[PDB]
Each structure stands twice: as structure tokens, then as C-alpha cells.
């Protein structure tokens, strides 16, 4: 799912937390990818 | 854990190696993230 809250309200600690592990890995890329995006923007800005 | 050695001295090949798989994935980001950090430093340096 895209929502952990429904997991929590219907599943158990172990499976919910492994699903959250893969969920949280996905968001930890998506963030640091975004940060990489932004600081290559910011490099082009700093040159300009 | 943060240490695979204790795993090896107390666990079996399959579970130890899956835990190492997730451990090694974490370090493979942390390295290539560091490399990305460094070569955006180095780009700012090369401009300067």
C-alpha cells in the first residue's frame, strides 16, 4: 500500500514493520534523490 | 545489528546473508551518496 496507517490498524508488528522497512527505504531515496536534484539546480544557479 | 561478525558467530547462512543483504544495500548507498557529495564539492571547487 501507500499508507502505513491502514497496515497499523490491520496488521501485526513484524509484517507491518518489514513493509514499513521497504516503504521507508523508498522514501529515503525519494528524498535524497530530490536533494541531489536540488543541489545540481543550485550548482547551475551558483554558476549563473 | 551494525555488526555482521556477531551474526556470523551466531547465526546460519541464509538469515545471516539476508541480513547482510540489507546491511550491504545500506552501505552501498552510503558510499555512493558520499561520492555524489564529494563530486558536487569538487564541481564547486572546479568552478572556483
Amino acid at each position: 500500500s501507500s499508507v502505513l496507517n491502514d497496515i497499523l490498524s490491520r496488521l501485526d508488528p513484524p509484517e507491518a514493520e518489514v513493509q514499513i522497512d521497504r516503504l521507508i527505504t523508498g522514501r529515503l531515496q525519494s528524498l535524497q534523490t530530490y536533494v541531489t536534484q536540488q543541489l545540481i539546480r543550485a550548482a547551475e544557479i551558483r554558476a549563473s | 545489528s551494525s555488526v555482521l561478525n556477531d551474526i556470523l558467530s551466531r547465526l546460519d547462512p541464509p538469515e545471516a546473508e539476508v541480513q547482510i543483504d540489507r546491511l550491504i544495500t545500506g552501505r552501498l548507498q552510503s558510499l555512493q551518496t558520499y561520492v555524489t557529495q564529494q563530486l558536487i564539492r569538487a564541481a564547486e571547487i572546479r568552478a572556483s
Binding site: - | 558467530s9 551466531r10 547465526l11 546460519d12
Partner: protein, 48 residues
Amino acid sequence: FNATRFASVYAWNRKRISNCVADYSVLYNSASFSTFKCYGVSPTKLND
């Protein structure tokens, strides 16, 4: 293993285990037990 008596589970008896030398690999080669689940620990590293 030569236990004389065990208290009932509804008030399962608890014992202290420490300050001795045990070869737990004997059990793995003992095979005298219905189940010998070593979870969170590999049986074949613990005698040493």
C-alpha cells in the same frame, strides 16, 4: 534433560542459567528431542 519434574505452563517454572560450561552442539548431535529450534542463534557455533 533428565528433568525430574516441570511445573505447569500456566505458571511455567523459571530457572537461572549462568556460570557454567555447556556444549550445546551435543543436543544437535543428540537428536534426543522432538524439536530443537535455535532461533536467533545457530546451534552449531555455541559449544565454543
